[PDB]
């Protein structure tokens, strides 16, 4: 696994996948789903990613197909405004509502 998010196993590919499609979105200024993807991340986990911000967050799913609407499941791709990768966060493992990075 490049990036495993609880028990769910994401190749860089299935990442790449799922981050062309957020950013197509967010580029047409057009969200998809009930909680609006994409849509900003503020990192107020304090990640230290490696590219610039600002983050938008999008869902990775573990079926692996490109979220098409429905439930964004626990993961999620972040990706910043010149379609740079920041890393994959989940909600696995995490307390209350935050989030802890995929390893
Ligand atoms: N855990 C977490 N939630 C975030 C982050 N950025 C945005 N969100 C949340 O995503 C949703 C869409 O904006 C909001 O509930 C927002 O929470 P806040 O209301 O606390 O800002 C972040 O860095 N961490
Ligand atoms: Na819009
Ligand atoms: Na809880």
Redesign the pocket.
Known sequence: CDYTCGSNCYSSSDVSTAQAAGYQLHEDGETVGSNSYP???????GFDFSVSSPYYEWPILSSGDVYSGGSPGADRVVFNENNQLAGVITHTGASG???VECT
């Open positions: 849509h900003k991340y503020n990192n107020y986990e509502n935050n989030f």
